[PDB]
Each structure stands twice: as structure tokens, then as C-alpha cells.
């Protein structure tokens, strides 16, 4: 029996729900192609690290992969749509925002030699610290782990000192004092056992950024018709299942952080007001960088 074999690099822990859904996707592709396409995922950055996956897929070093594409918004600012703070703070609203951004993002991805087969939101983003934080007076000079330009910008507005670290390297960065604070979901704090190093999480749910499963555009264009439709069928089903799993686990992760000794609370009123002011500035900066396209996306979203 003849079959194509593809390696699919992914950046997050093997037991993170995104990675598990990569395997679900591969199983569906194998079934729906009658065995003709067998995908093996490589989670945890074990084949290509997170910072390498986009280029690997663009050049065909890997045919398919998963990447958190807002970590490439410096090259393509439209990819920052999913880090606009306080714009879409629920799963339902994030789906509407993706619906408003999809055509423009698909066009931008094509210009980068990529096709996104499915995407999936992480849970809402909040702040991890090693101490109580009630205002930006408490955050001045704290070393911070960013995961993209938007989180680095947010950190700088709070007077923190950001450096980018991929999730697979986050535990060691915390253990060695590279950072004492970061923005992420409850999911990544759990997967990286961050209670070993930090004490507080503030549940802001400021945005729901997405992973994307991307395929090399030349490979996609050259696939047999049946293989291509099977990939899309598998992708649609996986994207639905992954987003359901993400939402089902969101609050469970918080309970796990608490069970391991962390203080998990909403941001205080003074702190939240600062975060919302910074978020408005970041949304204005994004709109200036993307221009009319950004105005169109936000308007289309608000009409839904
Ligand atoms: O919730 C999230 C967003 C990206 C990823 C991270 O911290 O790297 N976890
Ligand atoms: Cl569970």
C-alpha cells in the first residue's frame, strides 16, 4: 500500500489540547484519505522549535505545521488581529472576529506562501506574577516573558522588561530568573507547572489568540483533489473539536492552578482600568499599522 508520509511540527506540550488535536487531525486525514496520507505530529518543538515552524512550512522543509501566527505580526501586522485587547473576550466573540478577519488573513497568508487549514483559540489571556499586583506601580522593572510583539508591547507599557521565550522553554526561563511575569492562558501555566516559580494569576481574558495549522501553498496547490478535500474535511472537524475542548478546559486550568497553591483572581479595578487604557492604545496602533483593512475588520465584527 502506497502512502505519503508528512511530519507536522507543533510547539506546545504533547498533552496540551492543541497538540492532542493535531493527532486527531492526523487520524481524520488518514481515515478520509483511505490511508494515502499519514501525518505524524512532533509537538513540544521537538522537530522544529516554535520560532522555526513558519519558515519550515514556507520553504517546504516541513509540508504542514502549527504556528501561533501572531508571533509573526512584525512581518505581517494583519496577523495581530487576535491580540487586540478587550475587543473579543469570549469564544463566541472571537469566532465573530475571525469571521471578520478571515478573508484578509487568508490573502496575507497566501502572500507568505501559506494556507491555513484550521485555526483554534487559546483561552483568555491574563497575567502571571511572583507577587501581588494592584497597579503599574507594582510592575515597574519586572522581567517579563513575552510570546509575541503584542505581549512585549503590553509589558513595556506596564514598565516591565520583556524578552520572548517559546512555551517549550518557559519552565527553564522561570527557573533561571529570565522572567518573573508573563501573559498567557491558564492552559500554559498548567502545562508548564508555573506554580513552581510564580504565585499569582490575574484572570483578565483580554483576548483569545489563535494557533493556525498551515500548509505550504505550493504543496497545497499540487495535491490531488481528493487528498486536498480530505485535509479540509479533517481540518473543519478538528477546528470545531479543538475550540470546544479549549473552552471546556479554560476554567478547569484555573482550578488546577489554585490546587497547586496559586492565587487566581480577577484584576483589581485600578489595575483593570490601566490594562483597558493600554489596550485601547494598542488597538489604535494596530489600526494605524494596517490602515483601512483594519477599520473594515473591526467594523464587520461590530455588526455581527
Ligand atoms: O495561551 C497561550 C497563548 C500562547 C501560549 C503561550 O503562552 O506561549 N499560551
Ligand atoms: Cl480533564
Residues in the chain: 304
Mutate to test the pocket of ligand 1, among 124, 165, 185 (most ligand atoms within 8 A of CB): 185
CA–CA dist 31, 23 (Å, integer):
12
Residues with a CB atom less than 6 Å from ligand 1 = 68, 122, 147, 167, 184-185, 187-188, 209
Q: Convert 14-42 to b/e letters by CB count within 10 Å (16 or more is b).
A: eebbbbbbbbbbbebbbebbeebbebebb
Asked whether 213 and 64 are in contact (CB, 8 A), the reply is yes
* Distance from the Cα of residue 243 to its chain's centroid: 12
Start-to-end CA span in the chain (Å): 48
287 CA to middle of ligand 1, Å?
Answer: 23
Bin 60: left if φ > 0, else alpha if -120 < ψ < 50, else beta: left
Structural domain span for residue 269: 1-304
Q: Which of 158, 148, 167, 163 is nearest to 83 (CA)?
A: 148
Q: List the resolution, Å.
A: 1.4
- Given CA atoms 212, 215, 218, 222 in this order, what sign does their dihedral have? negative
Which residue puts its alpha carbon closest to atom 7 of ligand 1? 184
Q: Give me the CATH number covering residue 104.
A: 3.40.190.170
Q: Closest Cα to residue 226, out of 28, 13, 15, 33?
A: 33
Contact criterion met (CB below 8 Å) for 156 and 181: no
Tell me the DSSP string of the chain.
---EEEEEE--S-TTSHHHHHHHHHHHHHHHHTTTSEEEEEETTTTSS-HHHHHHHHHHTSSSEEEE-GGGGTTT-GGGGGGG-TTT--SHHHHHHHHHHHHHHHHHHHHHTTEEEEEEEEPPPPEEEESS--SSTTTTTT-EEEESSHHHHHHHHHTT-EEEE--GGGHHHHHHTTS-SEEEE-HHHHHHTTGGGT--EEE-------EEEEEEEHHHHHHS-HHHHHHHHHHHHHHHHHHHHHHHHHHHHHHHHHHHTT-EEEPPPHHHHHHHHHHHHHHHHHHHHHHTHHHHHHHHHHHT-
Q: How many structural domains compose the chain?
A: 1
Measured distance CA(49)–CA(257) in Å, rounded: 26
Amino acid at each position: 500500500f502506497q502512502s505519503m508520509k508528512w511530519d507536522m511540527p507543533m510547539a506546545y506540550a504533547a498533552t496540551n489540547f492543541h497538540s492532542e488535536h493535531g493527532v486527531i487531525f492526523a487520524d481524520k486525514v488518514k481515515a478520509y484519505t483511505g490511508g494515502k496520507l499519514e501525518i505524524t505530529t512532533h509537538p513540544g518543538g521537538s522537530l522544529f522549535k516554535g520560532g522555526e515552524i513558519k519558515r519550515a512550512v514556507q520553504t517546504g522543509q516541513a509540508p504542514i505545521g502549527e504556528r501561533f501566527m501572531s508571533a509573526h505580526a512584525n512581518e505581517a501586522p494583519l496577523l495581530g488581529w487576535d491580540n487586540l485587547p478587550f475587543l473579543a473576550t469570549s469564544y463566541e466573540d472571537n469566532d465573530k472576529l475571525w469571521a471578520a478577519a478571515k478573508d484578509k488573513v487568508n490573502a496575507q497568508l497566501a502572500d507568505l506562501n501559506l494556507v491555513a487549514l484550521y485555526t483554534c483559540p487559546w483561552p483568555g489571556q491574563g497575567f502571571y506574577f511572583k507577587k501581588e499586583v494592584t497597579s503599574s506601580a507594582d510592575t515597574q522593572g519586572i522581567k517579563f516573558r513575552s510570546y509575541n510583539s503584542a505581549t512585549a508591547t503590553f509589558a513595556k507599557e506596564l514598565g516591565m522588561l520583556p524578552v520572548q521565550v517559546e512555551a517549550a522553554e518557559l519552565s527553564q526561563a522561570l527557573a533561571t530568573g529570565v522572567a518573573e511575569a508573563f501573559i498567557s492562558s491558564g492552559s500554559t501555566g498548567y502545562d508548564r507547572k508555573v506554580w513552581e516559580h510564580l504565585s499569582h494569576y490575574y484572570k483578565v481574558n483580554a483576548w483569545l489568540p489563535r494557533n493556525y495549522v498551515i500548509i505550504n501553498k505550493g504543496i497545497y496547490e499540487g495535491l490531488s483533489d481528493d487528498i486536498r478535500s480530505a485535509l479540509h474535511k479533517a481540518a473543519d472537524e478538528t477546528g470545531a473539536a479543538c475550540a470546544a475542548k479549549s473552552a471546556e478546559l479554560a476554567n478547569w486550568y484555573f482550578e488546577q492552578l489554585e490546587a497547586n497553591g496559586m492565587k487566581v483572581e480577577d484584576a483589581g479595578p485600578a489595575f483593570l482600568k490601566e490594562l483597558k487604557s493600554i489596550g485601547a492604545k494598542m488597538q489604535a496602533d494596530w489600526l494605524a499599522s494596517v490602515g483601512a483593512d483594519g477599520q473594515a475588520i473591526v467594523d464587520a465584527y461590530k455588526k455581527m
